[PDB]
């Protein structure tokens, strides 16, 4: 095995730190013999070199099992070695790859051992093979190449390969090479003849730089198993996903189920995970059996049906636009597909995230759009054209009136029920001939006891006592009371900006049951006007509720 | 020779992640950086450099925008209290202020050898197909606050003849820009700017027009109305109640007397006349500057922005909440994000002109939305710090 003739990367220790000096533990005779054999062969290969006892640094070695292997525990050196640039900031998504006629994998034989280590850093990699018991001074070596398990090796190997591939890439610009650890993926649109010939030009270029690669008879055939994917030059899919059929589901089994389904959702449309995830909340040990909820059973059954037949994704054509379509699956659940030619998906996915305690479908849709927009730029370097289950009018109305700024890239309405809509709206002007309710709450923070109530312009009145409450809850409770007892048209005046803010954003779902009870009442109504006044400014009706609800509370 | 630059004690360089870039901006950056590399301004680097600063492309010519916000935080002692550039109080008074991009000057001055590693940046690839192209600066970079701090003495020498010949022209440097103010007639001002450009041209270095003397207060406006309803007065007292938190001496006691007992909102009630003493004299304080509020140079500036609809945006600049140093508005094929970026830039330059620093913005937008879109509409060579907030419901109509 050759050592690459490339330039070395200068390495330093962390500022104010010296090299490791951790002592060697006594080893058994069989382990010592095994290490001696390994180290003399490594020394003849040029990988390591003998040093004297003038070198003060040490890292412990160990021998593990017919054949033996040497383990160098670099924990202490790694702690003292400088930080490096990250090996990668992300991995390619298969959907972003372009279709090739042929693609070949070439693995590098003994990757790290083929690239030299900075001469001035070599002294810190020193290790000692101990003699039988205490007696003799041990045999001392240092590394000449990138050591396995050392902090800098991944980054320095990658950087070395990049420099080696650079000449070849520049004079062969229409051949694509992806670097991954010790593997090289090489694709082109050349005919079967001059592709296999082109691999040989690469293999000879790599061998010239001390990197050996497998020949035609040894190199793997497609599909290639990589990072949980199954890759053809023509199509891609996720690796075989098999959902076990079990009588009893443990936490561990459900965690693994959700993981598989989540992974599958990249190409299998409509995958659902919500009900299965609910089973894992505040859950016990991994061995604990969780009875499947009826909704979880139905979700599992729907997923099995989806995964029944194999599904593949296509590759990316840079000359065509990307199309993203989104559908609502249920409450909080969103699903999407991206294609270039109608219904031949490059990839699929799902969105579920709950941004904030209270929300609506319009906000969730936009959040889904922004998630897909970011994904698209990462994968394809451009935004897709969207097709959304919301009318332009509905979208128009919401964006204009809402306090928050947004921008959705080019999109079209598509009639795929359920359509996104707002379930109620607040009046811009007070209602003529409707009862005006003045509301307020009060809570005692010591006892957590509180009161919620109202007074009206028609002399109506009510107070309800609450037991484990907060200021905010009592204000919502008061508003809920006013809605319950009011009739189809109502004017409601609150001194709670918190309550105002929630309701003005037209939520249709909430983490609070109380807010959900308010939402249910707002939809039943014909007209609702909600106004705000400052608290304790001698405002007529407002002062009347305050005294009423604060009595016995504060 | 190079001037030695060091980080604030106990901390090292920036390790900020490179944001995802579109196809056209990556290609633009590759062309720009290949050219700079050939000219020796930047050099390719190895993996022994663990540092990173984000890079963007903005605009018809593409230009590189390096986001040195983090490096600038970690070098504050250098550019502020070691080689600080003084800010003139006369600039905000001027009839006209012209902004000239002067960043091209910096590439003629070498960067300190031991500091070059902290200027590391990455040009990413689409879909992480290839390793990012890594560089560091060999020269004073654009966007780094240390650059005008170091070039300071060279700029003084450049402007000396022009400043001698034109004593009543204020020239201020902030980052990559030169701010040039005068009280001359517009034609004469523009003639002097052209004159200044010629001086700069002889040194290699090579506009945007402001009128700060016409920057007047944005007063909280109380409605003139004939025939008030119960709802109208409630909205009015609520606006006045909050107005009293910022303005010292706002009264609302007389207006509240009209709202006594539980009355219907649509009931039209006639006003007295005891409230008119409040109403009218409230307008007096509302149109005037806030008494007792002054800029503290040891404190950060904060900017809040509210979306008002119809392409209108209100903003406030303060250091302690309620104590408004400045208020204003921004007005507009323009979308919400585009309008907001334009407003942020407008507020920032005013802030540079008035105080010599940028505010930290509280933006009424989702983080990810802002991050994907802001460079599409960004034109400035600096970048302010920002937060992402939920606009409180009534602050909007109070500043309306
Ligand atoms: C694992 C991997 C990741 C990134 N790109 C690729 C590969 N492997 C492929 O099999 C492949 C498939 C089709 C086209 N590009 C591919 N390649 C490109 C390099 C030829
Ligand atoms: O009674 C109060 C008080 C009082 C308690 C302390 C004195 C004022 C508030 O501050 C307040 C603030 C927002 C909303 N409702 C409120 N209510 O109902
Ligand atoms: Mn209250
Ligand atoms: Mn109260």
Swiss-Prot record, chain A:
Write out the ranges of the annotated region (RT 'primer grip'): 224-232
Q: What is the effect of changing residue 142 to M?
A: Confers both multi-NRTI and multi-NNRTI resistance
Q: What is the effect of changing residue 66 to G?
A: Confers resistance to didanosine, zalcitabine and zidovudine
Q: What is the effect of changing residue 280 to I?
A: Confers resistance to delavirdine, efavirenz and nevirapine
- Ranges for domain Reverse transcriptase come to 45-231
Q: Please tell me which stretches of this chain the record labels as motif Tryptophan repeat motif.
A: 395-411
Describe, as the record does, how this protein assembles with itself and its partners: Heterodimer of p66 RT and p51 RT (RT p66/p51). Heterodimerization of RT is essential for DNA polymerase activity. The overall folding of the subdomains is similar in p66 RT and p51 RT but the spatial arrangements of the subdomains are dramatically different.
What name is this protein filed under?
Reverse transcriptase/ribonuclease H
Q: Which organism is it from?
A: Human immunodeficiency virus type 1 group M subtype B (isolate HXB2) (HIV-1)
Taxonomic classification: Viruses, Riboviria, Pararnavirae, Artverviricota, Revtraviricetes
Which gene is annotated as encoding this protein in its UniProt record?
gag-pol
Portion of the parent chain present: 588 to 1144 of 1435
């Amino acid at each position: 095995s050759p050592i690459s003739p490339i330039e070395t990367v200068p390495v330093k220790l962390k500022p104010g730190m010296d090299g490791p000096k951790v002592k060697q533990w006594p080893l058994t005779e069989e382990k010592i013999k095994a290490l001696v054999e390994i180290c003399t062969e490594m020394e003849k290969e040029g990988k390591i070199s003998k040093i004297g006892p003038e070198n003060p640094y040490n890292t412990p070695v160990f021998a593990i099992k017919t054949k033996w292997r040497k383990l160098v525990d670099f924990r202490e050196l790694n702690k003292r070695t400088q930080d490096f640039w990250e090996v990668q900031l992300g991995i390619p998504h298969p959907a972003g790859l372009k279709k090739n006629k042929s693609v070949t994998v070439l693995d590098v034989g003994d990757a790290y051992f083929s690239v030299p280590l900075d001469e001035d850093f070599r002294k810190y990699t020193a290790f000692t093979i101990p003699s039988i018991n205490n007696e003799t001074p041990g045999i001392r070596y240092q590394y000449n190449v990138l050591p396995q398990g050392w902090k800098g090796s991944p980054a320095i190997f990658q950087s070395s390969m990049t420099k080696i591939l650079e000449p070849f890439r520049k004079q062969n610009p229409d051949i694509v090479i992806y670097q991954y650890m010790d593997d090289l993926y090489v694709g082109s649109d050349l005919e079967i003849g001059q592709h296999r010939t082109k691999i040989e030009e690469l293999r000879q270029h790599l061998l010239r730089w001390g990197l050996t690669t497998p020949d035609k008879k040894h190199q793997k055939e497609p599909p290639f198993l990589w990072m949980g994917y199954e890759l053809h030059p023509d199509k891609w899919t996720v690796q075989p996903i098999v959902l076990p059929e079990k009588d009893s589901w443990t936490v561990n089994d459900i965690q693994k189920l959700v993981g598989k389904l989540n992974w599958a959702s990249q190409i299998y449309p409509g995958i659902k995970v919500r009900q299965l995830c609910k089973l894992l909340r505040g859950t016990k040990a991994l061995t604990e059996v969780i009875p499947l909820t009826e909704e979880a059973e139905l979700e599992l059954a729907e997923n099995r049906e989806i995964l029944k037949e194999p599904v593949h994704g296509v590759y990316y054509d840079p000359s065509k636009d990307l199309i993203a379509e989104i559908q609502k699956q249920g409450q909080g659940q969103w699903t999407y597909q991206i294609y270039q030619e109608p219904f031949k998906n490059l990839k699929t996915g799902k969105y579920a995230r709950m941004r904030g305690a209270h929300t609506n479908d319009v906000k969730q849709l936009t959040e889904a759009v922004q998630k897909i927009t970011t994904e698209s730029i990462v994968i394809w370097g451009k935004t897709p054209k969207f097709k959304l289950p919301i009318q332009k009018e509905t979208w128009e109305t919401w964006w204009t009136e809402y306090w928050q700024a947004t921008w959705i890239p080019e999109w079209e309405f598509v009639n795929t029920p359920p359509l996104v809509k707002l379930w109620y709206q607040l009046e811009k002007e007070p209602i003529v001939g409707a009862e005006t309710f003045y509301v307020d709450g009060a809570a005692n923070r010591e006892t957590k006891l509180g009161k919620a109530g109202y007074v009206t312009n028609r002399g109506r009145q009510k107070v309800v006592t609450l037991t484990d409450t907060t200021n905010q809850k009592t204000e919502l409770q008061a508003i809920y009371l006013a809605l319950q007892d009011s009739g189809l048209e109502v004017n409601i005046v609150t001194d709670s900006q918190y309550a105002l803010g929630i309701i003005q954003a037209q939520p249709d779902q909430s983490e609070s049951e109380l807010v959900n009870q308010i939402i249910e009442q707002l939809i039943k109504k014909e007209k609702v006007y909600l106004a705000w006044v400052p608290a304790h400014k001698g405002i007529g009706g407002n002062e009347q509720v305050d005294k009423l609800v604060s009595a016995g509370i504060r | 020779e190079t001037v030695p630059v060091k980080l604030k004690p106990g901390m090292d360089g920036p390790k900020v992640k490179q944001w995802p870039l579109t196809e056209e901006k990556i290609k633009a950056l590759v062309e720009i950086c290949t050219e700079m590399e050939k000219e020796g301004k930047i050099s390719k680097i190895g993996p022994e450099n663990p540092y990173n600063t984000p890079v963007f492309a903005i605009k018809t010519k593409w230009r590189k925008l390096v986001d040195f916000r983090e490096l600038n935080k970690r070098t504050q002692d250098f550019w502020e209290v070691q080689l600080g550039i003084p800010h003139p109080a006369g600039l905000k008074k001027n009839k006209s202020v012209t902004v000239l991009d002067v960043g091209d000057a910096y590439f003629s001055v070498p960067l300190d050898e031991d500091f070059r590693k902290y200027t590391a940046f990455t040009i990413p690839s689409i879909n992480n197909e290839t390793p990012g192209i890594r560089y560091q600066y060999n020269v004073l970079p654009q966007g780094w606050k240390g650059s005008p701090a170091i070039f300071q003495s060279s700029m003084t020498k450049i402007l000396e003849p022009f400043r001698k010949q034109n004593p009543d022209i204020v020239i201020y440097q902030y980052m990559d820009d030169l701010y040039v103010g005068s009280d001359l007639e517009i034609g004469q001002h523009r003639t002097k700017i052209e004159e200044l450009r010629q001086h700069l041209l002889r040194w290699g270095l090579t506009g945007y027009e402001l009128h700060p003397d016409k920057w007047t207060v944005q007063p909280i406006v109380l409605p003139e109305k004939d025939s008030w309803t119960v709802n109208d007065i409630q909205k009015l007292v609520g606006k006045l109640n909050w107005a009293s938190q910022i303005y010292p001496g706002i009264k609302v006691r007389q207006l509240c007397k009209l709202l006594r007992g539980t009355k219907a909102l649509t009931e039209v009630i006639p006003l007295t006349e005891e409230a008119e003493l409040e109403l009218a004299e409230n307008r007096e304080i509302l149109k005037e500057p806030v008494h007792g509020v002054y800029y503290d140079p040891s404190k950060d500036l904060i900017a809040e922005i509210q979306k008002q609809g119809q392409g209108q945006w209100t903003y406030q600049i303060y250091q302690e909440p309620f104590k408004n140093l400045k208020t204003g508005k921004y007005a507009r094929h323009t979308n919400d994000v585009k309008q907001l970026t334009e407003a942020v830039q407008k507020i920032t330059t005013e802030s540079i002109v008035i105080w010599g620093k940028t505010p930290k913005f509280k933006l009424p937008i989702q983080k990810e939305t802002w991050e994907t879109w802001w460079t599409e509409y960004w034109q400035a060579t600096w970048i302010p710090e920002w937060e992402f907030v939920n606009t409180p419901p009534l602050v909007k109509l109070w500043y309306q």
